[PDB]
Scaffold this motif. Structure first.
Motif, PDB file in Angstrom:
ATOM      1  N   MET A   1      38.890  48.074  45.483  1.00 25.71           N
ATOM      2  CA  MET A   1      39.870  47.733  46.493  1.00 25.71           C
ATOM      3  C   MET A   1      41.088  47.113  45.868  1.00 25.71           C
ATOM      4  O   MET A   1      41.118  46.870  44.663  1.00 25.71           O
ATOM      5  CB  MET A   1      39.300  46.765  47.509  1.00 25.71           C
TER       6      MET A   1
ATOM      7  N   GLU B   1      34.553  38.636  44.273  1.00 21.15           N
ATOM      8  CA  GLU B   1      35.361  39.602  43.509  1.00 21.15           C
ATOM      9  C   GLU B   1      34.863  39.651  42.061  1.00 21.15           C
ATOM     10  O   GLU B   1      34.501  38.621  41.492  1.00 21.15           O
ATOM     11  CB  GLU B   1      36.840  39.185  43.464  1.00 21.15           C
TER      12      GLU B   1
ATOM     13  N   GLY C   1      35.155  44.194  45.025  1.00 16.55           N
ATOM     14  CA  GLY C   1      34.802  43.096  45.905  1.00 16.55           C
ATOM     15  C   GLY C   1      33.828  43.399  47.017  1.00 16.55           C
ATOM     16  O   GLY C   1      33.499  44.540  47.232  1.00 16.55           O
TER      17      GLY C   1
ATOM     18  N   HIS D   1      42.700  44.905  51.167  1.00 17.75           N
ATOM     19  CA  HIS D   1      42.766  43.642  51.871  1.00 17.75           C
ATOM     20  C   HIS D   1      43.866  43.831  52.941  1.00 17.75           C
ATOM     21  O   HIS D   1      44.918  44.445  52.655  1.00 17.75           O
ATOM     22  CB  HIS D   1      43.231  42.532  50.903  1.00 17.75           C
TER      23      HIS D   1
ATOM     24  N   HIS E   1      40.771  45.480  42.199  1.00 17.11           N
ATOM     25  CA  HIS E   1      39.609  44.741  41.763  1.00 17.11           C
ATOM     26  C   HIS E   1      38.393  45.332  42.461  1.00 17.11           C
ATOM     27  O   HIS E   1      38.502  46.306  43.192  1.00 17.11           O
ATOM     28  CB  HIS E   1      39.798  43.258  42.109  1.00 17.11           C
TER      29      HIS E   1
ATOM     30  N   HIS F   1      34.287  36.111  50.128  1.00 22.55           N
ATOM     31  CA  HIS F   1      34.661  37.426  49.601  1.00 22.55           C
ATOM     32  C   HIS F   1      34.490  37.295  48.092  1.00 22.55           C
ATOM     33  O   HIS F   1      35.214  36.580  47.429  1.00 22.55           O
ATOM     34  CB  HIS F   1      36.079  37.766  50.003  1.00 22.55           C
TER      35      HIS F   1
HETATM   36 CU   LIG Z   1      38.819  41.759  47.370  1.00 21.32          CU
END
Ligand SMILES: [Cu+2]
Ligand SMILES: [Cu+2]
Lengths: 159, 159
Positions: free
Chosen positions: A88, A44, A97, B132, A95, A42
């Protein structure tokens, strides 16, 4: 570990711009991004206002409504892929991502190795975000689109 | 000019939601909002995270990617108008705002007097903003659409 830093952060255009990766993260709304099961990391971007930001953002605030395209290149194999990060939030804040297939990537060549990462960043106007431009409360013009570059060794999914 | 606060701020759904109005503000990019020349006020919604925000936003951070509509009702005359607030930045930081015709509105009935203001607010998912939801860094569900109400006396364009 848990969170792996990519290169060194850059400071440009009144922002700090850092890159990190985690293990794949399940996201909602479902289907908003590549499924965690189909990914290996993932990725970022952490982008916050510096002191005396020229566009009205207080020190430390998240920089919202940015467009962030990326280019990830394995310089050992030549493999290149492109995408965009999406805005997100995690439990430690907002942030940009994206879940990314590395070893699972279908064309291959995105395994363990040496990488170059490029972020292509464009200002909030592209996404409908406005600026006061009056004398009393107005703010300065936004930066033109720019790029920042990182190099890192990818060692596999953080675990 | 100067800011005129509208009612009392409300705390709900992880956020403080306040309303203020100023003199009309020219906005860029030009055409993104009603021209300052055609308005009497610039209405702002100031929305920031509370402590322990359940969607991961740090206390005091701006709440971004919200969909916000307003309804303004003159309770003396019964005139109602509606519109959307747009995300933007001023010297003091990001917020949601709109230039609004009051005395200038040709329908009439939006002059000096007693008003009710309602904001209709929907969560960031509606605009593609993700969360998330993994065990380690995940956050909980967003609020369903909601409204908040204020009462205030409109005394004319701030001076
Ligand atoms: Cu993220
Ligand atoms: Cu404004």
């Amino acid at each position: 570990g848990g969170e792996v830093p990519i290169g060194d952060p850059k400071e440009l255009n009144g922002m700090e711009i850092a890159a990190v990766y985690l293990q794949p993260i399940e996201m909602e709304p479902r289907g908003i991004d590549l499924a965690a099961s189909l990914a290996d990391i993932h990725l970022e971007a952490d982008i916050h206002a510096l002191k005396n930001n020229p566009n009205g953002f207080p020190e430390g605030f998240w920089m919202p409504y940015l467009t962030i395209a990326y280019e990830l290149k394995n310089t050992d194999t030549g493999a290149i892929k492109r995408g965009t990060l999406m805005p997100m939030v995690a439990d430690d804040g907002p942030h940009y991502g994206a879940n990314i297939a590395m070893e699972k990537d279908k064309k291959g060549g995105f395994g363990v190795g040496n990488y170059e990462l490029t972020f292509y960043i464009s200002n909030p106007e592209k996404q409908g975000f406005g600026r006061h431009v009056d004398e009393e409360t107005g703010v300065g013009k936004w930066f033109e689109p720019f790029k920042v570059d990182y190099k890192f060794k990818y060692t596999g999914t953080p675990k």
